[PDB]
């Protein structure tokens, strides 16, 4: 089963990438299963969500934990709320980069995207 692990925000980079302190080492992390462009709006939403959180958690999927750029690949939670899902639910990201076997939350995210699109939010306006 997947599990959540603590981490610390060092810096928000853009809509879907961040620097975290993870087990005592600074690392770039990249959100699984999403692509953010509405570029500046996606960056702003991500930054506010992670900076305001009191607790950040990393949840790796069941395959590779890093990409070819050395970035951690994870579902990131801000006070227990998944940031990847929050961005898609606002129409500030699309479900993208789906690489098996790291696809555990794909259906969940796809349903959020469908809602954003049905509500004509942001990218879908
Ligand atoms: C989200 C994700 C991206 N990537 C790669 C695909 C893209 O490669 P290329 O750079 O070769 O196109 C790149 C896009 O990331 P960004 O959207 O941060 O630029 O990161 C993965 O390998 N695994 C992943 O889970
Ligand atoms: Ca991107």
Swiss-Prot record:
Residues binding Ca(2+): 16, 35-36
Chain residue ranges for the region called Disordered: 105-125
Highest taxon above the source species: Bacteria
Compartment(s) where it occurs, according to its Swiss-Prot or TrEMBL record: Secreted
Active site: 30, 71
Composition bias, Basic and acidic residues: 105-121
Annotated protein name in UniProt: Nuclease A
Organism in which the protein naturally occurs: Staphylococcus aureus
């Amino acid at each position: 089963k997947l599990h959540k692990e603590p981490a610390t925000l060092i810096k928000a980079i853009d809509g879907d990438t961040m620097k975290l302190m993870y087990k005592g080492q600074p690392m770039t992390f990249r959100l699984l299963l999403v692509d953010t462009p509405y570029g500046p709006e996606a960056s702003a939403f991500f930054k506010k969500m992670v900076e305001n959180a009191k607790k950040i958690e990393v949840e790796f999927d069941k395959g590779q934990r890093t990409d070819k750029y050395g970035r951690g690949l994870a579902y990131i939670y801000a006070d227990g709320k998944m940031v990847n899902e929050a961005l898609v639910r606002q129409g500030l990201a699309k479900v993208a980069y789906v690489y098996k076997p790291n696809n555990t939350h794909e259906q969940h995210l796809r349903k959020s995207e469908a809602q954003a699109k049905k509500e004509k939010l942001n990218i879908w306006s």
